[PDB]
Design a protein around this ligand. Structure first.
Ligand code: V74
Ligand code: V74
Ligand code: V74
Ligand code: V74
Ligand code: CL
Ligand code: CL
Ligand code: CL
Ligand code: CL
Lengths: 212, 212, 212, 212
């Protein structure tokens, strides 16, 4: 595509996109074009508006585009072209990526006892309500646990909510504790969002006892 | 995929899918699995049900799967596996395709006069509310008009309704009437649905005058 | 999207798309833009060309766009904008749909004997190498057989070739012949292409004997 | 879906997937099922093999599935079900995600001089050949530069190679240096891969002079 400003828009929240170079109030020679999950290729939106799109995305008096409650299908590309009073044309190009933050992750079915030297089910981490899916990972006394690297194995599952489309992730951790290791290790799980610079969420720790 | 019974389901209407081989009433050893636009790969549904899926697809007392109002995202694959009283297992496999019938097509902006030997805009045919999109085509005195043959040109547009996802099609017809041809030709447009054996819908005819 | 000329392009064959309004030979102020399965949104192509796109789609001396061998990923939208010597701008807008014709369909595993009044497997129809998938249907002495309508049942399967992406369809027909019906009925299967105005392909007939 | 082992497979490299529980050498009662970009829903593969799938994914003597050179279309789900000599059934479930590492990112068109208190184009960062796309980000003397905070603006572009499908990313950085700040700042750009635990790649730094 072309060079664009990246926009991250939280699902359910409003979004205002500026039409650069447009006069401050009507009359305005401007046009918006959008290609999103709602459209077949480009759809043109005008200041006069009208029709079913008025419920979804409307041009404001200052020429900006307004979406009262972003959904997953609004992901896509949004462009404006405007002429100012002098006649200079100005383009605006946005790439809109949508997201939702899940609830704090939880560990369910955690083991209270582990036996050293054999595989043990440690627990299952669950995160509900993300978009995009994101990922879950495990930590042992503050360091990342890497699957298939040192007696660690992980299985993962993804589900979607049938109406909202948001993701539920589950991750089951198994470990073989090394003989002579720490008798009260501390495990946690973290949710890492898909989009850049979004913060991780962490579970409360679990601390089983390890039998030599 | 595997061999399946093809199911066509109209958007907004209920759908009942039989679980072959299941006992007539509970208790029943059966399981449904579905992979549709709502799911991440296979989702399992059980007679006990529960959760947000109960609003979308529920197992009935006789083991059939019930969807009270099909939508576009229910397109996909639906399977049941059941054991009867004797313990014989029976599989059911369905491929569900969704559709909606548009309103009767209309001709807008029709020409009242055509000039023979030059290109003329005849009209624009519009169909609103189909799924899958389907196609529009033109006819002249009962015979198909083929684009790019014998002085015929057509341009087409597709749009989607931003909330329902249903398609609006437009088709603009241009013709160059042959000199010495019929002075009062009859044009019509037809909507052809995407799915097999669904009937076409036809516009009222238009009858311009042709000037030699 | 916008109004476009519909283009149907056979997979593996070249495609030339005209840039309306461009000068006949260089120098030319024109630009092509395409959004297809190969692109992230719009890709711009220029008369000078260069790079990996030269292998796929190149501007010719007369300003037309040339694809030496269309593939499935070239489905999409192709646009040109040109200025003539006078400075008039002209736009060209194409919607390109790709297709391939399968081999003639065949009936395999046909029954030689049918018993009236009970269900019988009649045969399996197979079509290899279509795009888009298309559909198979059955006929009995020249009339369409409708699934689930009169002791007729059909099961269907779709597969894709792992390298070419082309579709193989299979359709298994079962019938319960009516008592006192024709002792030597004639069944056939037809392949119906997905795109408009493309011709159907038909199998050779089978003529089992029916036992009263 | 169901619980699965996550597999990350580099494009162009072989992949071997174990069929847990299968006998060590033929004869073996096992079956693989896969649903990937190459398939229409589930495709079954058997030890005997045959056909065009042998070029893509083949069962080995020990029952493992072998792909000699993974591509983007092999992303998906791979499952085995086997019986051992005793008759115990074992399932294996894999979710295969594909990737490619781009070349080291580069800064092009870097500014040698910046003026404090006004916006300045700093440079354009380019990364070629990733899958999934990944993202680019900028740093100033070792700290992340956040777009739209403290006089920082970024624009981004994504393109795909027309034959390989791999992504090229570009990111253009603009900054307004604060008056009285460091006269010789150090900027760099980093590529962050899409998949978890893959390492970032960093450009060589640039050090323009800032004029008060
Ligand atoms: O006299 C009057 O009453 C009157 C006159 C004009 C008018 O409205 C316009 C005023 C200026 C220009 C345009 C024409 O611009 C369309 C457009 C609208 C969105 C985006 C783009 C666009 C395109 C592209 O589509 O080519 N590429 C891009 C790349 C990056 C960013 C944007 C684009 C173009 C329309 C209204 C009323
Ligand atoms: O004791 C109890 O209380 C109790 C016992 C069992 C039970 O429920 C089942 C009763 C019989 C068998 C199965 C196990 O079948 C799962 C399945 C469910 C849907 C579809 C399929 C399926 C698969 C596949 O997934 O392999 N392939 C197919 C191809 C074509 C058609 C269907 C399939 C399999 C579950 C409930 C309660
Ligand atoms: O001086 C020189 O050396 C020199 C000058 C110009 C030049 O090349 C051009 C000559 C005329 C106009 C344009 C600018 O047009 C871009 C474009 C290219 C494809 C398609 C479209 C397009 C858009 C849209 O993108 O807005 N919408 C559409 C709707 C329907 C059909 C097409 C479009 C626009 C570029 C080369 C050299
Ligand atoms: O006598 C002989 O010569 C002979 C006998 C059997 C034979 O091969 C099989 C040996 C055991 C079982 C099965 C039947 O299993 C199919 C299957 C194959 C892949 C995956 C799955 C599967 C399903 C599912 O599809 O239901 N769900 C899952 C969830 C997680 C993991 C896997 C699955 C099922 C086939 C070959 C030869
Ligand atoms: Cl799901
Ligand atoms: Cl639209
Ligand atoms: Cl397949
Ligand atoms: Cl691109």
């Amino acid at each position: 595509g072309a060079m664009a400003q990246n926009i991250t828009a939280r699902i359910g929240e409003p979004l205002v996109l500026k039409c650069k170079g447009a006069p401050k109030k009507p009359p305005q020679r401007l046009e918006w074009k959008l290609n999103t999950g709602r459209t077949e290729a480009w759809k043109v939106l005008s200041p006069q508006g009208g029709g079913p799109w008025d419920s979804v995305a409307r041009v404001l008096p200052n020429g900006s585009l307004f979406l009262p409650a972003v959904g997953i299908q609004d992901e896509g590309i949004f462009r404006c072209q405007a002429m100012n009073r002098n006649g200079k044309e100005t383009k605006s190009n946005y790439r809109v990526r949508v997201y939702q933050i899940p609830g704090k992750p939880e560990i369910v079915d955690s083991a209270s006892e582990l036996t050293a030297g054999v595989p043990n089910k440690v627990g299952t981490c669950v995160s509900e309500g993300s978009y995009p899916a994101g990922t879950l990972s495990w930590h042992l006394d503050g360091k990342p646990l890497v699957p298939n690297e040192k007696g660690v194995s992980v299985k993962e599952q993804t589900r979607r909510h049938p109406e909202t489309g948001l993701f539920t992730l589950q991750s089951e951790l198994m470990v073989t504790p090394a003989r002579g290791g720490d008798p009260r290790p501390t495990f946690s799980c973290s949710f890492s969002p898909g989009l850049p610079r979004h913060r991780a969420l962490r579970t409360a720790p679990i601390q089983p006892r390890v039998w030599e």
